[PDB]
Amino acid sequence: GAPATVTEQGEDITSKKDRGVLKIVKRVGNGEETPMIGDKVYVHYKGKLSNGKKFDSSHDRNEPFVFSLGKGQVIKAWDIGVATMKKGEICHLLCKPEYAYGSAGSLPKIPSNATLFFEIELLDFKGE
């Protein structure tokens, strides 16, 4: 399925080239511009664990998730991944634990040493 496909066919978007964050662009976005550091970014997403369980979805809340890019307000994989996206893009991101919740995990839903799969849609980005 989609997690296997990004695992096997995704692009390594890490600066270290350590395959910690792999990406496939699923829906091509608009033009060429990507957000810059400190922009307010608006995303919809869903996340799955490697046991197949959904652990989160903004769609199910009927509101986007909003954060300031490149400030560590989200896991490293998201700061790295969302920075590569165009407005209107949908991508898949496969996030090894070193770019996610590491050995700690995040109670109650994310175990230790968890590889995470996300589908992310970049709705908008704006400077403040």
Q: In the beta sheet, which residues pair with residue 74?
A: none
Separation CA 21–CA 118 (nearest Å): 11
Of 60, 62, 79, 82, nearest in space to 71 by CA:
79
118 is catalytic: yes
Closest approach of Cβ 30 to ligand 3JP, in Å?
22
117 binds ligand 3JP (CB under 6 A): no
Q: Are 48 and 120 in contact (CB under 8 A)?
A: no
56 binds ligand 3JP (CB under 6 A): yes
The number of angstroms, rounded, from the C-alpha of 15 to the middle of its chain's C-alpha atoms is 16
Of 100, 105, 106, nearest in space to 21 by CA:
100
The residues in 3-42 that bind ligand 3JP, with binding defined as CB under 6 A, are none
> Which C-beta is closer to ligand 3JP: that of 10 or that of 101?
101
42 is catalytic: no
> Which C-beta is closer to ligand 3JP: that of 20 or that of 47?
47
**Residues taking part in catalysis:** 45, 55-56, 75, 101, 118
Site residues, ligand 3JP (CB under 6 A): 47, 55-56, 65, 72-75, 78, 101, 106, 109-110
